[PDB]
């Protein structure tokens, strides 16, 4: 009824004249033998939830273990008859759960990913008890895969080169790790939604996503997690990101708008076409925004492309078509507010980087399902997408560097994405702007 | 490179100077005993896919059967020893599949929902053969539920009042239908993803959504279907929709903008508050847009609410803040184009109803997961949402009637939504505008 508009995020809020006074968090429990992609799922899911704004953190019991033990000697550390190490392993689990408690009850976290094997009913029972007693929801993710080819390949890809094997050649690293896995085999009790685990909320991922069993999804975040797990795959592939060729507003320093390519932006577009041909890709999808400059760039390729409105550049609202010099002059306060809080700032009647993230989510979801893809887009859009793939925070996203006429080439390696930059050697202007009391204290 | 902007949808396209020259469709196969919600899933999924723009149609073999037989006498028609009727039933299935073929190969349909029991391997095999031979993808949805309470309740809710029982009282309708179900029991072969159905793409829905088994999702549309099935529920509930109280742009005939409530819009807001209290709901969620007028309306309720940017009113781009009389005067061609194709039309630098649908999809998905919800929104937004619940086409959506100060109350009944209108007796202006050669032929 009486409301004021917040100056940064442009949100209407009730005017509070007295500010002097005055949906449980969730633990995701990983389950499975070693080298089943538990840690891979932990990190990727966490990169997703963070980028869409649900604060999430991975608690990797193995890293608590390395912290406490220092150098790994061999699989003998994991024998079920190793009384002292079984004890230390338990201690690492319980220290991880203490931090889980602190994260969720004290540091404003919403999702805690408890990444360990959790292969016995007894250990899962204790985790349930800890969640109940603290009022957290529990959701279980079990990865099941007995294909020896996938296990072998997982070991080569992430295990022989982990810190546990700093000292090792490949063949013996592999040999140690195989025996380490067989340590857990005799006591492993897979999740059983028919009998014993009927009242648990869970997903079983089977044969790398070929099949899934889902029991009792409870809420908003749980059903998204399941949809996300069902749409990612481990096939190797490549993602290319770039901006439209230089346009005429770029030549004028003007933001937003819908102008066409300059003669350089056009020369870039032919360079992009030769570059793509030289990559020699089997099938390649091409995506653009609905703005003219990205579409003119894609036409030079002579490949089919799809236009997405969700890839249009951030909307500057009343500042569209203006230069930054015009904005500082006409809207000095809006100018200063954007520089102090560039992620959360919304242009009047336009958008923030925060809004851009929400709108790009379906683009990200579909990119997960594709193989080879080239995305021709815009400066602020490209920073968002890059923040997702490279795991950058919200505070750094609006400052990521993404110059004109340069392709960022992303390849899946280990637990994330390697980025490689290829500048296509066509000049263009620079659109990157770096991050930028006296009277308001006494002795005025 | 050389492109033109389409006048209605504002899409850049290559200029074609010679227009004189020049991802398989999918059959969804329903599977299950009678009264397992197959038809319910068929219709609801189809209402969803159509509203998000994937042309879909239900082929209900039972309706082919009623067409061909005329009056139903009893469950004896469904006996496996009824040689002549087994023949006619088969004929209805094959006539349905012919129409499926015509819909998908000839009428531009993309998804065909084949709604029948399909309870034997032999019948499913023939459907596979028909899909293969025509190059369609096949995806199976099996509903499994042996809770006698749910079956009984499903029969009371949709079967005793179906056309098959026009002639009948409740007890005997129920009795006939129970025996009809037991006709199919002996030969029923549930989908078996372990052995026989390992290479099929399928979802098994178990105990009304308590549990799911998912085998080999293949593509974009299949993974959305699964996510949609996992998020709807049959618990009874109520959805309320209305607009912000009247605002000052409403008093001026002006479109878009961010103005506050008039004194009437405020009187409506207290009326809404008393109305909500009189409904006596257990928990009620309240959603608004981020525009001031909806938020001022929600404050009068003194209940917690959530603001969604996706509920903001359609964006009129360069025409924001203008009256319709100013738009006709300054942009006569844009005015005329919008009147001739109101769904697909996009305001320059703004949106169409088509864009509004894409942006509201997450709102619809989340409404599916809720129980009691009140959505305070805007004229064009409210028509979109109402088109989804009431199954209206794209061509009618922009003309649906949704006056100020009136709540639309939606309740789940049978296979859809009943709508009830409650006007809260506060005057307001009217914002509804109805749908509106000579020189371009010779004898000029
Ligand atoms: N669902 C899955 N099943 C089996 N392997 C997977 C799965 N998802 C990812 N991977 C592979 O798992 C490997 C990483 O294993 P890691 O996450 O370190 O396993 P863990 O934590 O279970 O010991 C990567 O090679 C990745 O490709
Ligand atoms: N997954 C499900 N399992 C069981 N019943 C359901 C399911 N989904 C909806 N229903 C109920 O099914 C009833 C409608 O049955 P109907 O679709 O006519 O069944 P069928 O087509 O299998 O004969 C409705 O009462 C609805 O609430
Ligand atoms: S199902 C709960 C568990 N009980 C059993 O394992 C009995 C055998 C299985 N239930 C079965 O065959 O059905 C349980 O709590 N086990 C404790 C453990 O640590 O193994
Ligand atoms: S699995 C393919 C089917 N063969 C069988 O049913 C053999 C028995 C089961 N496979 C089993 O117990 O594993 C099949 O095609 N059956 C044809 C039918 O119409 O029943
Ligand atoms: O967030 P920033 O750095 O202002 O960059 C986004 C701007 O960059 C541009 O893409 C090019 O200058 C403008 O169209 C857009 O407003
Ligand atoms: O699609 P239509 O009928 O022009 O209605 C949408 C318009 O209605 C209003 O909500 C109220 O007039 C405007 O804010 C908006 O532009």
């Amino acid at each position: 009824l009486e409301l004021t508009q917040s100056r940064v995020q442009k949100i209407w809020v009730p005017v509070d004249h007295r500010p002097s006074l005055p949906n449980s968090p969730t633990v995701i429990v990983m389950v499975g033998l070693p080298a089943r992609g538990k840690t891979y799922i932990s990190k990727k899911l966490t990169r997703y939830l963070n980028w869409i704004g649900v604060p999430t953190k991975v608690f990797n019991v193995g890293e608590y273990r390395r912290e406490a033990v220092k150098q790994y000697s061999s699989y003998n550390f994991f024998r079920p008859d190793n009384e002292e190490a079984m004890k230390v392993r338990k201690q690492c689990a319980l220290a991880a759960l203490r931090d889980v408690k602190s994260y969720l009850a004290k540091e404003g976290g919403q999702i805690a990913v408890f990444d360990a094997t959790n292969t016995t009913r007894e250990r899962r029972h204790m985790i349930l008890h800890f969640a109940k007693e603290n009022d957290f929801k529990a959701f279980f993710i079990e990865s099941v895969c007995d294909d020896p080819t996938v296990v072998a390949s997982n070991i080569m890809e992430v295990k022989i080169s982990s810190p546990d094997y700093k000292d090792c050649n490949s063949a013996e690293a592999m040999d140690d790790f195989m025996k380490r896995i067989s340590c857990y085999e005799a006591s492993y009790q897979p999740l059983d939604p028919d009998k014993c685990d009927r009242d648990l909320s869970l997903i079983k991922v089977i044969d790398v996503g070929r099949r899934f069993l889902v029991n009792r999804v409870q809420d908003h975040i749980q059903s998204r997690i399941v949809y996300y797990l069902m749409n990612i795959h481990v096939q190797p592939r490549t993602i290319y990101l770039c901006r439209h060729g230089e346009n005429e507003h770029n030549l004028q320093g003007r933001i937003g708008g819908d102008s066409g390519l300059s003669s350089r932006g056009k020369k870039f577009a032919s360079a992009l076409s030769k570059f793509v041909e030289e990559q020699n890709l089997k099938d390649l999808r091409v995506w653009t925004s609905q703005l003219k400059s990205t579409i003119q760039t894609a036409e030079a390729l002579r490949l089919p492309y799809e236009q997405w409105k969700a890839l249009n550049e951030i909307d500057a609202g009343v500042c569209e078509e203006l230069t930054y010099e015009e904005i500082r002059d006409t809207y000095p306060e809006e100018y200063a507010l954007r520089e102090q809080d560039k992620y959360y700032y919304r242009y009047p009647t336009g958008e923030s980087y925060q809004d851009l993230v929400q709108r790009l989510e379906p683009v990200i979801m579909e990119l997960e399902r594709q193989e080879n893809v080239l995305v021709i887009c815009h400066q602020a859009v490209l920073r968002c997408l890059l923040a997702y793939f490279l795991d950058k925070s919200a505070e750094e996203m609006p400052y990521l560097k993404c110059p004109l006429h340069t392709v960022l080439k992303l390849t899946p390696v280990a637990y994330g994405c390697r980025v490689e930059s290829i500048y296509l050697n066509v000049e263009s202007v620079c659109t990157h702007r770096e991050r930028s009391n006296p009277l308001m204290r006494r002795n005025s």
Side-chain angles (χ1 to χ4, degrees), chain A:
Chain A
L1 300 139
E2 220 209 6
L3 301 168
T4 186
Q5 192 178 52
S6 74
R7 281 215 313 164
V8 174
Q9 299 178 93
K10 302 303 175 302
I11 297 298
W12 291 99
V13 298
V15 318
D16 178 19
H17 281 322
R18 251 13 317 272
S20 262
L21 326 79
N23 67 127
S24 293
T26 301
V27 177
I28 298 171
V29 191
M30 308 308 295
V31 181
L33 294 176
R36 266 52 184 189
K38 299 181 306 292
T39 292
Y40 178 94
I41 292 168
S42 297
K43 293 174 170 283
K44 195 157 169 162
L45 187 58
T46 294
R47 178 160 63 74
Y48 172 74
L49 295 165
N50 283 126
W51 182 87
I52 72 170
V54 183
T56 306
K57 192 183 171 179
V58 179
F59 299 80
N60 184 155
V61 187
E63 273 160 31
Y64 284 72
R65 186 266 303 168
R66 286 211 335 109
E67 159 80 22
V69 162
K70 278 107 191 157
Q71 197 53 281
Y72 179 74
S73 44
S74 86
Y75 76 90
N76 290 277
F77 182 83
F78 294 94
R79 291 163 51 166
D81 67 342
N82 195 328
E83 190 170 70
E84 148 159 80
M86 284 285 278
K87 180 170 333 182
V88 167
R89 287 175 51 212
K90 194 176 176 128
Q91 286 164 4
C92 289
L94 294 171
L97 288 179
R98 154 255 271 147
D99 293 345
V100 173
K101 193 188 156 164
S102 144
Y103 174 67
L104 287 191
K106 291 179 193 102
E107 305 155 351
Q110 162 66 41
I111 313 280
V113 187
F114 193 68
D115 174 27
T117 55
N118 295 320
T119 44
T120 64
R121 282 181 185 145
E122 168 279 306
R123 175 58 49 88
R124 289 182 311 255
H125 174 81
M126 156 185 112
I127 298 162
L128 246 16
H129 182 110
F130 160 97
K132 179 39 182 295
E133 82 186 333
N134 286 275
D135 242 82
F136 307 148
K137 309 180 156 172
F139 184 59
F140 297 79
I141 308 185
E142 177 174 35
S143 178
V144 187
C145 180
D146 314 294
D147 176 339
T149 306
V150 166
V151 173
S153 157
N154 288 173
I155 289 174
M156 294 310 290
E157 171 153 336
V158 311
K159 303 300 174 172
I160 54 153
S161 49
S162 56
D164 281 345
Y165 297 96
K166 106 145 108 296
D167 260 57
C168 236
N169 82 100
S170 281
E172 68 209 354
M174 168 68 84
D175 172 77
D176 181 86
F177 204 86
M178 285 308 284
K179 296 199 253 257
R180 191 167 158 171
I181 286 158
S182 92
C183 289
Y184 287 86
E185 281 168 343
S187 69
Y188 174 27
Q189 296 164 302
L191 298 183
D192 180 36
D194 294 356
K195 249 191 304 274
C196 329
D197 305 302
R198 183 190 343 96
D199 311 317
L200 296 194
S201 305
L202 74 97
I203 180 173
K204 200 180 275 263
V205 182
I206 292 167
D207 295 329
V208 202
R210 157 143 39 264
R211 181 206 271 123
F212 302 92
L213 193 164
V214 187
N215 204 235
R216 305 181 169 263
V217 168
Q218 311 176 58
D219 67 7
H220 172 238
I221 214 58
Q222 296 180 14
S223 82
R224 288 295 274 292
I225 277 151
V226 162
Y227 176 56
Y228 186 75
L229 300 175
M230 311 186 30
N231 290 279
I232 60 176
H233 65 270
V234 306
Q235 277 26 78
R237 47 101 157 234
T238 309
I239 296 149
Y240 307 85
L241 309 175
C242 64
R243 289 158 72 182
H244 51 89
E246 189 184 58
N247 60 36
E248 322 238 76
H249 277 22
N250 295 327
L251 300 178
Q252 299 183 297
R254 296 194 170 271
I255 74 181
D258 196 13
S259 54
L261 288 193
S262 69
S263 39
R264 298 144 143 185
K266 298 178 161 190
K267 291 187 170 63
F268 171 66
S270 349
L272 180 66
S273 181
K274 206 179 145 185
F275 172 82
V276 167
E277 176 180 322
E278 279 152 11
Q279 297 295 291
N280 232 288
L281 305 172
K282 222 69 217 278
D283 286 312
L284 173 61
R285 317 274 94 95
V286 186
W287 298 351
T288 69
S289 73
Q290 299 182 340
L291 302 161
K292 183 173 200 193
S293 62
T294 66
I295 295 160
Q296 276 178 299
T297 304
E299 282 285 319
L301 309 172
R302 285 128 23 202
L303 301 174
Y305 56 97
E306 202 172 335
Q307 306 189 198
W308 292 64
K309 209 184 188 258
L311 291 168
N312 281 181
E313 183 50 314
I314 201 174
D315 182 331
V318 300
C319 300
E320 283 276 312
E321 317 272 0
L322 264 45
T323 55
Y324 291 99
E325 141 280 322
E326 301 163 336
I327 297 167
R328 188 190 42 242
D329 296 346
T330 317
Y331 308 92
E333 282 197 27
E334 284 304 317
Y335 193 89
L337 295 162
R338 199 173 187 256
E339 274 187 279
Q340 44 128 109
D341 199 4
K342 198 187 190 197
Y343 183 83
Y344 289 100
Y345 174 97
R346 175 180 298 163
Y347 279 103
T349 89
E351 289 176 308
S352 60
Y353 276 83
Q354 188 175 211
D355 299 337
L356 246 190
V357 165
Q358 174 146 71
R359 167 156 77 75
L360 288 164
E361 190 279 349
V363 178
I364 280 324
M365 194 70 86
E366 183 64 34
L367 278 167
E368 291 296 350
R369 289 188 58 77
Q370 301 279 145
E371 308 219 305
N372 300 327
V373 189
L374 162 62
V375 180
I376 309 166
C377 60
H378 304 260
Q379 184 162 256
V381 171
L382 177 26
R383 293 176 168 143
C384 297
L385 291 185
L386 207 59
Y388 167 86
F389 294 109
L390 262 18
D391 194 30
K392 305 298 186 176
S393 73
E395 162 194 37
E396 30 189 9
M397 172 185 318
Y399 301 101
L400 296 170
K401 278 170 159 154
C402 328
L404 287 165
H405 296 4
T406 304
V407 176
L408 312 171
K409 173 197 184 159
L410 305 156
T411 53
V413 62
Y415 293 127
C417 302
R418 161 182 190 233
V419 61
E420 174 181 348
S421 182
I422 303 98
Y423 168 50
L424 306 186
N425 193 34
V426 175
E427 290 285 320
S428 65
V429 306
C430 182
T431 56
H432 191 265
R433 307 165 60 82
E434 289 295 23
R435 89 184 74 214
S436 231
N437 322 341
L439 300 142
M440 215 84 138
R441 56 130 68 177
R442 267 176 236 173
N443 283 69
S444 52

PDB file of all heavy atoms in Angstrom, chain A residues 49-63:
ATOM      1  N   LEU A  49      23.482 -25.350  -9.294  1.00  0.00           N
ATOM      2  CA  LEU A  49      22.686 -24.745  -8.229  1.00  0.00           C
ATOM      3  C   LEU A  49      23.248 -23.372  -7.777  1.00  0.00           C
ATOM      4  O   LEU A  49      22.522 -22.419  -7.516  1.00  0.00           O
ATOM      5  CB  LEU A  49      22.614 -25.674  -7.059  1.00  0.00           C
ATOM      6  CG  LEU A  49      21.891 -26.959  -7.308  1.00  0.00           C
ATOM      7  CD1 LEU A  49      22.192 -27.971  -6.204  1.00  0.00           C
ATOM      8  CD2 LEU A  49      20.407 -26.693  -7.423  1.00  0.00           C
ATOM      9  N   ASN A  50      24.563 -23.270  -7.703  1.00  0.00           N
ATOM     10  CA  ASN A  50      25.120 -21.993  -7.394  1.00  0.00           C
ATOM     11  C   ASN A  50      24.814 -20.957  -8.487  1.00  0.00           C
ATOM     12  O   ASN A  50      24.308 -19.879  -8.186  1.00  0.00           O
ATOM     13  CB  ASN A  50      26.585 -22.058  -7.133  1.00  0.00           C
ATOM     14  CG  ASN A  50      26.889 -22.616  -5.739  1.00  0.00           C
ATOM     15  OD1 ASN A  50      27.648 -23.566  -5.620  1.00  0.00           O
ATOM     16  ND2 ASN A  50      26.256 -22.088  -4.717  1.00  0.00           N
ATOM     17  N   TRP A  51      25.132 -21.280  -9.734  1.00  0.00           N
ATOM     18  CA  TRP A  51      24.841 -20.358 -10.829  1.00  0.00           C
ATOM     19  C   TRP A  51      23.355 -19.972 -10.935  1.00  0.00           C
ATOM     20  O   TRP A  51      23.058 -18.808 -11.172  1.00  0.00           O
ATOM     21  CB  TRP A  51      25.353 -20.960 -12.113  1.00  0.00           C
ATOM     22  CG  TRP A  51      25.162 -20.113 -13.317  1.00  0.00           C
ATOM     23  CD1 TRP A  51      26.006 -19.123 -13.815  1.00  0.00           C
ATOM     24  CD2 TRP A  51      24.036 -20.185 -14.249  1.00  0.00           C
ATOM     25  NE1 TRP A  51      25.515 -18.615 -14.986  1.00  0.00           N
ATOM     26  CE2 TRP A  51      24.335 -19.209 -15.310  1.00  0.00           C
ATOM     27  CE3 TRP A  51      22.862 -20.935 -14.304  1.00  0.00           C
ATOM     28  CZ2 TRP A  51      23.476 -19.007 -16.397  1.00  0.00           C
ATOM     29  CZ3 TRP A  51      22.004 -20.749 -15.405  1.00  0.00           C
ATOM     30  CH2 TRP A  51      22.294 -19.825 -16.426  1.00  0.00           C
ATOM     31  N   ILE A  52      22.414 -20.890 -10.710  1.00  0.00           N
ATOM     32  CA  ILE A  52      21.040 -20.406 -10.592  1.00  0.00           C
ATOM     33  C   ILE A  52      20.712 -19.854  -9.211  1.00  0.00           C
ATOM     34  O   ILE A  52      19.543 -19.758  -8.939  1.00  0.00           O
ATOM     35  CB  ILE A  52      19.929 -21.458 -10.843  1.00  0.00           C
ATOM     36  CG1 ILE A  52      19.863 -22.453  -9.681  1.00  0.00           C
ATOM     37  CG2 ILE A  52      20.060 -22.132 -12.193  1.00  0.00           C
ATOM     38  CD1 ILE A  52      18.610 -23.391  -9.729  1.00  0.00           C
ATOM     39  N   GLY A  53      21.668 -19.517  -8.323  1.00  0.00           N
ATOM     40  CA  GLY A  53      21.278 -18.811  -7.054  1.00  0.00           C
ATOM     41  C   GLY A  53      20.820 -19.637  -5.819  1.00  0.00           C
ATOM     42  O   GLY A  53      20.339 -19.078  -4.858  1.00  0.00           O
ATOM     43  N   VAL A  54      20.976 -20.961  -5.804  1.00  0.00           N
ATOM     44  CA  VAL A  54      20.744 -21.777  -4.582  1.00  0.00           C
ATOM     45  C   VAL A  54      22.110 -22.132  -3.964  1.00  0.00           C
ATOM     46  O   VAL A  54      22.839 -22.969  -4.509  1.00  0.00           O
ATOM     47  CB  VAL A  54      20.039 -23.065  -4.944  1.00  0.00           C
ATOM     48  CG1 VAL A  54      19.722 -23.886  -3.701  1.00  0.00           C
ATOM     49  CG2 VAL A  54      18.797 -22.724  -5.737  1.00  0.00           C
ATOM     50  N   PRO A  55      22.511 -21.420  -2.902  1.00  0.00           N
ATOM     51  CA  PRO A  55      23.817 -21.673  -2.292  1.00  0.00           C
ATOM     52  C   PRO A  55      24.049 -23.159  -1.872  1.00  0.00           C
ATOM     53  O   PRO A  55      23.297 -23.782  -1.096  1.00  0.00           O
ATOM     54  CB  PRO A  55      23.845 -20.721  -1.071  1.00  0.00           C
ATOM     55  CG  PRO A  55      22.696 -19.791  -1.249  1.00  0.00           C
ATOM     56  CD  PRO A  55      21.666 -20.535  -2.067  1.00  0.00           C
ATOM     57  N   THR A  56      25.089 -23.720  -2.452  1.00  0.00           N
ATOM     58  CA  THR A  56      25.345 -25.134  -2.356  1.00  0.00           C
ATOM     59  C   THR A  56      26.804 -25.333  -2.152  1.00  0.00           C
ATOM     60  O   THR A  56      27.630 -24.632  -2.734  1.00  0.00           O
ATOM     61  CB  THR A  56      24.934 -25.855  -3.668  1.00  0.00           C
ATOM     62  OG1 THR A  56      23.573 -25.529  -3.976  1.00  0.00           O
ATOM     63  CG2 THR A  56      24.980 -27.346  -3.479  1.00  0.00           C
ATOM     64  N   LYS A  57      27.157 -26.349  -1.372  1.00  0.00           N
ATOM     65  CA  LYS A  57      28.571 -26.692  -1.238  1.00  0.00           C
ATOM     66  C   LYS A  57      28.782 -28.229  -1.133  1.00  0.00           C
ATOM     67  O   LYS A  57      27.971 -28.956  -0.567  1.00  0.00           O
ATOM     68  CB  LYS A  57      29.155 -25.954  -0.018  1.00  0.00           C
ATOM     69  CG  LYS A  57      30.669 -25.943   0.136  1.00  0.00           C
ATOM     70  CD  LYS A  57      30.950 -25.211   1.449  1.00  0.00           C
ATOM     71  CE  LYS A  57      32.399 -25.319   1.837  1.00  0.00           C
ATOM     72  NZ  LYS A  57      32.670 -24.574   3.110  1.00  0.00           N
ATOM     73  N   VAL A  58      29.889 -28.663  -1.712  1.00  0.00           N
ATOM     74  CA  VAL A  58      30.356 -30.056  -1.687  1.00  0.00           C
ATOM     75  C   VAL A  58      31.197 -30.316  -0.417  1.00  0.00           C
ATOM     76  O   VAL A  58      32.109 -29.553  -0.126  1.00  0.00           O
ATOM     77  CB  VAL A  58      31.232 -30.408  -2.913  1.00  0.00           C
ATOM     78  CG1 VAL A  58      31.677 -31.894  -2.770  1.00  0.00           C
ATOM     79  CG2 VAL A  58      30.435 -30.201  -4.248  1.00  0.00           C
ATOM     80  N   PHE A  59      30.848 -31.341   0.347  1.00  0.00           N
ATOM     81  CA  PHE A  59      31.709 -31.865   1.471  1.00  0.00           C
ATOM     82  C   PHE A  59      32.210 -33.269   1.091  1.00  0.00           C
ATOM     83  O   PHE A  59      31.423 -34.246   1.094  1.00  0.00           O
ATOM     84  CB  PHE A  59      30.904 -31.893   2.772  1.00  0.00           C
ATOM     85  CG  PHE A  59      30.432 -30.552   3.167  1.00  0.00           C
ATOM     86  CD1 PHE A  59      29.266 -29.993   2.543  1.00  0.00           C
ATOM     87  CD2 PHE A  59      31.156 -29.785   4.087  1.00  0.00           C
ATOM     88  CE1 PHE A  59      28.867 -28.707   2.837  1.00  0.00           C
ATOM     89  CE2 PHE A  59      30.740 -28.512   4.391  1.00  0.00           C
ATOM     90  CZ  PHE A  59      29.570 -27.975   3.771  1.00  0.00           C
ATOM     91  N   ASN A  60      33.455 -33.287   0.645  1.00  0.00           N
ATOM     92  CA  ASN A  60      34.119 -34.448   0.087  1.00  0.00           C
ATOM     93  C   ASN A  60      34.941 -35.102   1.207  1.00  0.00           C
ATOM     94  O   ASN A  60      35.999 -34.610   1.533  1.00  0.00           O
ATOM     95  CB  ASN A  60      34.987 -33.999  -1.082  1.00  0.00           C
ATOM     96  CG  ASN A  60      35.649 -35.161  -1.801  1.00  0.00           C
ATOM     97  OD1 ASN A  60      35.990 -35.073  -2.992  1.00  0.00           O
ATOM     98  ND2 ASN A  60      35.936 -36.215  -1.058  1.00  0.00           N
ATOM     99  N   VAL A  61      34.406 -36.169   1.818  1.00  0.00           N
ATOM    100  CA  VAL A  61      35.076 -36.870   2.910  1.00  0.00           C
ATOM    101  C   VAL A  61      36.528 -37.332   2.566  1.00  0.00           C
ATOM    102  O   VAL A  61      37.436 -37.362   3.446  1.00  0.00           O
ATOM    103  CB  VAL A  61      34.200 -38.046   3.424  1.00  0.00           C
ATOM    104  CG1 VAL A  61      34.832 -38.654   4.658  1.00  0.00           C
ATOM    105  CG2 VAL A  61      32.849 -37.540   3.878  1.00  0.00           C
ATOM    106  N   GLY A  62      36.767 -37.687   1.317  1.00  0.00           N
ATOM    107  CA  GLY A  62      38.139 -38.039   0.892  1.00  0.00           C
ATOM    108  C   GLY A  62      39.158 -36.928   1.146  1.00  0.00           C
ATOM    109  O   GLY A  62      40.336 -37.162   1.486  1.00  0.00           O
ATOM    110  N   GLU A  63      38.731 -35.694   0.976  1.00  0.00           N
ATOM    111  CA  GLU A  63      39.578 -34.521   1.197  1.00  0.00           C
ATOM    112  C   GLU A  63      39.779 -34.245   2.672  1.00  0.00           C
ATOM    113  O   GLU A  63      40.842 -33.783   3.087  1.00  0.00           O
ATOM    114  CB  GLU A  63      38.926 -33.284   0.489  1.00  0.00           C
ATOM    115  CG  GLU A  63      39.366 -33.181  -0.961  1.00  0.00           C
ATOM    116  CD  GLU A  63      38.464 -32.329  -1.851  1.00  0.00           C
ATOM    117  OE1 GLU A  63      37.806 -31.320  -1.406  1.00  0.00           O
ATOM    118  OE2 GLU A  63      38.425 -32.682  -3.062  1.00  0.00           O
TER     119      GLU A  63
END
